[PDB]
C-alpha cells in the first residue's frame, strides 16, 4: 500500500539556564528508525531500527550535522517568536516541526508536507501545492513574507518531492523484511457480565501493523454506535499495535451482535460473533 517518511522535531526552552531541550525522531510509516536527544550523551543521530544500522559512518555524520543545524535553528526561532509575541524570558515555550513525504503503492511521490507550531498552536505550514504558505496569525505572516523573499518553498519542494522520496525508497528496500510486511490483527472476543440483565462484548485486535485499522459493531447486520466504546489505537511496545471496541448488550442477545475488522493485512474484512 502507501508509505510515508516523516520527521518530528520538538524544542522546549529552559528559561532558568541553558539551551532548549531538543528532540528529533524519524519514522517510516509507523516505525521509528532514528532519534536525536540533546540531553543524551552521544550527541549523534542514533539508530532505532535494525535496518538503518546498515548505513555507514558517512550517513550518521551527515544526519548528525543536519540535525544539529535543526537544533540551532529552533533555538533561534524560540527567541524570535518570544519577541514576536512579546513574552518574557520567565516562561518555557515550545516549537514543533513536522515534515516528510507520502508515496502511493507505486512508491512514487504522492504528497509532501511541512508544518510548524508554537506553544501547541498552528504557526506556519506549507500548502499542498508546495508553492505557498499558510500563516495562522500576523506574526506568522512576517515569516511568510521572509520565506517568500528567500524562495524557501522552492528548495523545500526539491527535498519533499525528490530527496525525501529517494530516501524512503531506499529505506523501504533495505528494511523490506519488516517495512514491507503487513501484520494482520490477531482478533478475539471477550464477554463480561455486569448484571443478570446486561453484558459487555469486547472485540480485540492485537499485534497488527501498520496502526491503521477499523473496528465496528453491527446488530442484526446493521451498524451500531450507541452503547459502544472504542479505545484509541495504542502501541504494544514491540513495534505492533492494539485496539479494542466494546458494546453493551442485553444478556442472552449476544449472537445478534458482530464485530467487523478492516486492516491492510486482511484480504477481506473479518467478522466475529460470540
Amino acid at each position: 500500500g502507501s508509505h510515508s517518511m516523516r520527521y518530528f522535531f520538538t524544542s522546549v526552552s529552559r528559561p532558568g539556564r541553558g539551551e532548549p531541550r531538543f528532540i528529533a525522531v524519524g519514522y517510516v510509516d509507523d516505525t521509528q528508525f532514528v532519534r536525536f536527544d540533546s540531553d543524551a550523551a552521544s550527541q549523534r543521530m542514533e539508530p532505532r531500527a535494525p535496518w538503518i544500522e546498515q548505513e555507514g559512518p558517512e550517513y550518521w555524520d551527515g544526519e548528525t550535522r543536519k540535525v544539529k543545524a535543526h537544533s540551532q535553528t529552533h533555538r533561534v526561532d524560540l527567541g524570535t517568536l518570544r519577541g514576536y509575541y512579546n513574552q518574557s524570558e520567565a516562561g518555557s515555550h515550545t516549537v514543533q516541526r513536522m515534515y516528510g513525504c507520502d508515496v502511493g503503492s507505486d512508491w512514487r511521490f504522492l504528497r509532501g508536507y511541512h508544518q510548524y507550531a508554537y506553544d501547541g498552536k498552528d504557526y506556519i505550514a506549507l500548502k499542498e501545492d508546495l508553492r505557498s504558505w499558510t500563516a495562522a496569525d500576523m506574526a506568522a505572516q512576517t515569516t511568510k513574507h521572509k520565506w517568500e523573499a528567500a524562495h524557501v518553498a522552492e528548495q523545500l519542494r526539491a527535498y519533499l518531492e525528490g530527496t525525501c522520496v529517494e530516501w524512503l525508497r531506499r529505506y523501504l528496500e533495505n528494511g523490506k523484511e519488516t517495512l514491507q510486511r503487513t501484520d494482520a490483527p490477531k482478533t478475539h472476543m471477550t464477554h463480561h457480565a455486569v448484571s443478570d440483565h446486561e453484558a459487555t462484548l469486547r472485540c480485540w485486535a492485537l499485534s497488527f501493523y501498520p496502526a491503521e485499522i477499523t473496528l465496528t459493531w453491527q446488530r442484526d447486520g446493521e451498524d451500531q454506535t450507541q452503547d459502544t466504546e472504542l479505545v484509541e489505537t495504542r502501541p504494544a511496545g514491540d513495534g505492533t499495535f492494539q485496539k479494542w471496541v466494546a458494546v453493551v448488550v442485553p444478556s442472552g442477545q449476544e449472537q445478534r451482535y458482530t464485530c467487523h475488522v478492516q486492516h491492510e493485512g486482511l484480504p477481506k474484512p473479518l467478522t466475529l460473533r460470540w
Binding site: 535543526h70 526561532d77 515534515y99 520565506w147 528567500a150 524557501v152 523545500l156 527535498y159 530527496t163
Partner: peptide, 9 residues
C-alpha cells in the same frame, strides 16, 4: 534522511 537546508523563522 533529513532536510539539508533549514531556515530560521
Amino acid at each position: 534522511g533529513i532536510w539539508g537546508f533549514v531556515f530560521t523563522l
